[PDB]
C-alpha cells in the first residue's frame, strides 16, 4: 500500500478512501484526486458551435391526423434495451408488443443478471434482427457506466452495415408502449430530422446543484464515490432532464465520430459525473451544430410521484440521494389516452407489483386474445436457476427451498390411498433446479420448486415441481386493515420485496401496519418469541393521513427460531395479531451445519435477552406464561443436527406452509400425479402472452 502522489486533505476524498474495500479502488481514487488537484482532469472552458442565441425548441403542434397516413418511406428503428433483473417473461411480453421485422433490437444485459442473459440469448438466436452486446457492464443506479453503455452501443450500431436504422430508442424492462407501432413509424417518418430530448425547464442553477454536476464522482467497486468539487466549464450552456430519448442517425454519428472541442471535452467531463445520461446528450445538442433539431419532448410518460419515490433509497450505492418513478396501477389507465402532446412509451411497469394495468394496456393496443387462452391473469418469475449455483443463494433460502421440496414429497405419498405398495413414495436428491414466484390476479400464490427425487417403488429418478402456499396468519379481534412482518421493505411501492417472508436467526424483522381513513389514534405493539418471551414493546401515533407504518425493533441476535407473534393493542383492548417464522438453518456456508454451529445459532441471543429493557411484567397481564418444558425443549432443539434437526424445521414449515399440489415433468410411476404442462399453476404450463413464435405476414409477433 504505497502512499499517494499528492497530499490528500479533502473531507470527501478521505471519507471515500476509508470506506473503500479493494486496494485497486484506493489507488484509483487517489490518482483521480491528485489529477484534479493539479488542474489536469476536468476541462475549464469549452467551445460552443451553436449559431443560435440560446435554445431552439421546434414545436410539433399535434393533431391526431398526424399519425394516420401511410408513409411511402418509413423509418427503421434501432431499439436498444438496457435490461436487468428476473422479469424475463415481462420483458418477453413487451418485446412482443414492439417487434417488427423492419426494425432492429440490440440488448445489453447487466453483468449481475446472468439468468436474464441466458433467456435473452434464446431470443437473439431466433430472429436475425436481434442481437446481444458481447460486452456487459454493472450499470448501477446513477453510475457513469450507463453513458459508457449508450456510447458504445451507438458505435457498435453505426458499424453494423447490414442494419440501416434511422432512429435510436432506449428502453428498460419496465417500459411499455402506449401506442401502436404503425403510429410510431408514421410520426417519426414525418420528423426524421429531429431529436427528442426532454428538459427540466425549471431553474438551471438549482438543477445543477441538485444533480451534483459540480461534484467530482468516480465509479469503482460498483459504487459512485464523491471526491470533491469542480467548476462548470465556461462558454457553454448546461441542460438536462430525462435520460430516455429518441436520437436520429445523423446526430448519433456526430456524438460518436466528432473530434471537435465540444464532444472531446464533454466525454472527459461526464466520465466523472453522477447520472451523466440525464445531462450529457442535452448539453452536446444545444451547443453542437445540430442545436436547431431539439424537440423539448422525449415522447415518454414517467410516473413521477416524489411524495413516494424520493426516500434517498440509493444511499448505499452512491454518495447522493436518488429518486425513482412509481409503478402504474389500473387507475392510471386513462392517463395513456391524453390528448395534450405526443407520447408513445411509458414507465414504470412491474408485473410483480401490478399486472392488470399491463393486460389492459396491451389489449387496448392489439386486441384481446382468443377464448380459452390460458395464463392471461397469471405471472411467473424465476428467483433461482441451477446454473448460477447454490453459493448464489443464502443459507436461509437454501434451507427453506429444500424444506418446501420435502413438503411436496410428503403430499405425494399421502395422496395415493392404497393398502399395497405406495408408488408415490420419494427420496429427495441433490439441490433444487429452479424456483419461481407465482401470482394470480395480482395475488401472490407462493413458490414453485423444481427438484429431483427417486421413486422408491420403481427405484428411478423423477423430476417434479411443487407448489407451496403460506397459511393466513392475520387475525382481527377500527382503522387497522392489515399487519405483516418481513424484510426488504420498499418505501416507494410500499410492500416487501422478500415475498415469502423467508427469515433466519440472524435476520432483522420489520413490522408493517396498514391503516384506513379515520381520526388520529395511538396503538401498542408487542413482539413475542416462540417461548412466550416478550422481546419489545412500543407505542405508535397513527395520524389521520397515515396509510402505512413500519418499524424495525432493535433485537440482539441470534433470534430464537420458531413461530413468533406480533400483537397490536388499543389501551389493553386486543385489536389484531400476526405470526412469522424464524427458521433454523440446516446449512452453514452451503454445507450441513455442525453441532458447534447449530448450538451457537439456534439458542437465543448471545446476551440472554433481545434488549436491555426487560418486559417480564407484561407476561402475566397478557396470559403469556412461560412453560419450563417448552423452554427446556427449545434448549434441546438447539443442540440437534442432521435428522433430528430436519424434523424440527419441517415441523415448523409444515405448520406455516401448505403444499398445494405437485406435478411431474416427464414420465412418472405415481398414478395420482398430473403432468406439469397440463396444469394451470406450473411454470411448464402454456403462457402464450409471453411466448415468442414465428413472424407473421404483417411483420409482427403479437
Amino acid at each position: 500500500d504505497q502512499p499517494p502522489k499528492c497530499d490528500i486533505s479533502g473531507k470527501e476524498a478521505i471519507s471515500a478512501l476509508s470506506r473503500a474495500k479493494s486496494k485497486h479502488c484506493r489507488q484509483e481514487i487517489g490518482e483521480t484526486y491528485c489529477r484534479h488537484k493539479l488542474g489536469l482532469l476536468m476541462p475549464e472552458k469549452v467551445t460552443r458551435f451553436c449559431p443560435l442565441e440560446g435554445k431552439a425548441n421546434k414545436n410539433v403542434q399535434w393533431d391526431e391526423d398526424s399519425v394516420e397516413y401511410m408513409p411511402a418511406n418509413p423509418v427503421r428503428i434501432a431499439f436498444v434495451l438496457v435490461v436487468h433483473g428476473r422479469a424475463s417473461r415481462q420483458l418477453q411480453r413487451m418485446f412482443k408488443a414492439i417487434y417488427h421485422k423492419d426494425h432492429f433490437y440490440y440488448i445489453h444485459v447487466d453483468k449481475r443478471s446472468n439468468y436474464l442473459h441466458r433467456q435473452v440469448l434464446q431470443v437473439s438466436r431466433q430472429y436475425s434482427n436481434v442481437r446481444v452486446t458481447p460486452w456487459r457492464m454493472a450499470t448501477i443506479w446513477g453510475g457513469a457506466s450507463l453513458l459508457s453503455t449508450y456510447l458504445q452501443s451507438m458505435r457498435d450500431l453505426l458499424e453494423m452495415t447490414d442494419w440501416p436504422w434511422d432512429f435510436f430508442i432506449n428502453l428498460s424492462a419496465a417500459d411499455y408502449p402506449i401506442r401502436t407501432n404503425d403510429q410510431l413509424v408514421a410520426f417519426l417518418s414525418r420528423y426524421r430530422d429531429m431529436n427528442f430530448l426532454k428538459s427540466h425547464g425549471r431553474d438551471n442553477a438549482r438543477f445543477i446543484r441538485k444533480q451534483g454536476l459540480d461534484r467530482l464522482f468516480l465509479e469503482c467497486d460498483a459504487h459512485m464515490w464523491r471526491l470533491g468539487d469542480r467548476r462548470i466549464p465556461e462558454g457553454i450552456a448546461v441542460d438536462g432532464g430525462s435520460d430516455w430519448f429518441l436520437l436520429n442517425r445523423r446526430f448519433v454519428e456526430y456524438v460518436t465520430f466528432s473530434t471537435d472541442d465540444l464532444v472531446t471535452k464533454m466525454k472527459q467531463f461526464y466520465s466523472y459525473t453522477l447520472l451523466p445520461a440525464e445531462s450529457f446528450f442535452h448539453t452536446v445538442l444545444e451547443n453542437s451544430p445540430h442545436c436547431d433539431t431539439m424537440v423539448d419532448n422525449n415522447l415518454r410518460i414517467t410516473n413521477w410521484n416524489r411524495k413516494l419515490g424520493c426516500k434517498c433509497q440509493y444511499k448505499h450505492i452512491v454518495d447522493w440521494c436518488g429518486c425513482s418513478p412509481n409503478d402504474f396501477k389500473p387507475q392510471d389507465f386513462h392517463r395513456f389516452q391524453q390528448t395534450a402532446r405526443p407520447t408513445f412509451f411509458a414507465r414504470k411497469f412491474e408485473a410483480v407489483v401490478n399486472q392488470e394495468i399491463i393486460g389492459q394496456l396491451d389489449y387496448y393496443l392489439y386486441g384481446n386474445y382468443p377464448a380459452g387462452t390460458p395464463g392471461l391473469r397469471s405471472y411467473w418469475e424465476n428467483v433461482y436457476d441451477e446454473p448460477d449455483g447454490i453459493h448464489s443463494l443464502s443459507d436461509v433460502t437454501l434451507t427453506l427451498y429444500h424444506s418446501f421440496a420435502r413438503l411436496g414429497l410428503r403430499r405425494a405419498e399421502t395422496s395415493l390411498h392404497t393398502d399395497g405398495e405406495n408408488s408415490c413414495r420419494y427420496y429427495p436428491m441433490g439441490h433444487p433446479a429452479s424456483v419461481h414466484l407465482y401470482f394470480l390476479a395480482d395475488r401472490f400464490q407462493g413458490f414453485l420448486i423444481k427438484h429431483h427425487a427417486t421413486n422408491l417403488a420403481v427405484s428411478k429418478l423423477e423430476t417434479l415441481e411443487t407448489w407451496v402456499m403460506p397459511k393466513k396468519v392475520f387475525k382481527i379481534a377500527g382503522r387497522l386493515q392489515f399487519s405483516e412482518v418481513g424484510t426488504d421493505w420498499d418505501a416507494k411501492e410500499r410492500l416487501f420485496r422478500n415475498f415469502g417472508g423467508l427469515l433466519g436467526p440472524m435476520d432483522e424483522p420489520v413490522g408493517m401496519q396498514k391503516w384506513g381513513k379515520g381520526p388520529n389514534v395511538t396503538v401498542t405493539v408487542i413482539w413475542v418469541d416462540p417461548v412466550n418471551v416478550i422481546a419489545a414493546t412500543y407505542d405508535i401515533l397513527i395520524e389521520s393521513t397515515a396509510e402505512f407504518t413500519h418499524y424495525k425493533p432493535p433485537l440482539n441476535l441470534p433470534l430464537r427460531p420458531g413461530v413468533w407473534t406480533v400483537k397490536i393493542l388499543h389501551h389493553w383492548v386486543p385489536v389484531a395479531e400476526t405470526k412469522f417464522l424464524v427458521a433454523p438453518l440446516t446449512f452453514s456456508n452451503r454445507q450441513p451445519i455442525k453441532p458447534e454451529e447449530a448450538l451457537k445459532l439456534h439458542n437465543g441471543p448471545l446476551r440472554n435477552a433481545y434488549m436491555e429493557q426487560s418486559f417480564q411484567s407484561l407476561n402475566p397481564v397478557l396470559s403469556l406464561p412461560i412453560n419450563p418444558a417448552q423452554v427446556e425443549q427449545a434448549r434441546r432443539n438447539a443442540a440437534s443436527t442432521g435428522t433430528a434437526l430436519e424434523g424440527w424445521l419441517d415441523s415448523l414449515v409444515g405448520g406455516m406452509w401448505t403444499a398445494m399440489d405437485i406435478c411431474a415433468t416427464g414420465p412418472t410411476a405415481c398414478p395420482v400425479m398430473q403432468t406439469c404442462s397440463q396444469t394451470a399453476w406450473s411454470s411448464f404450463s402454456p403462457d402464450p402472452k409471453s411466448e415468442l413464435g414465428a413472424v407473421k405476414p404483417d411483420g409482427r409477433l403479437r
Binding site: 441538485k210 438536462g240 447520472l275 414517467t302 447522493w320 429518486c323
Partner: peptide
C-alpha cells in the same frame, strides 16, 4: 411532469 432523478446531497 418534472424531470431530474437526483434528489440532492441530503
Amino acid at each position: 411532469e418534472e424531470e431530474g432523478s437526483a434528489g440532492g446531497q441530503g
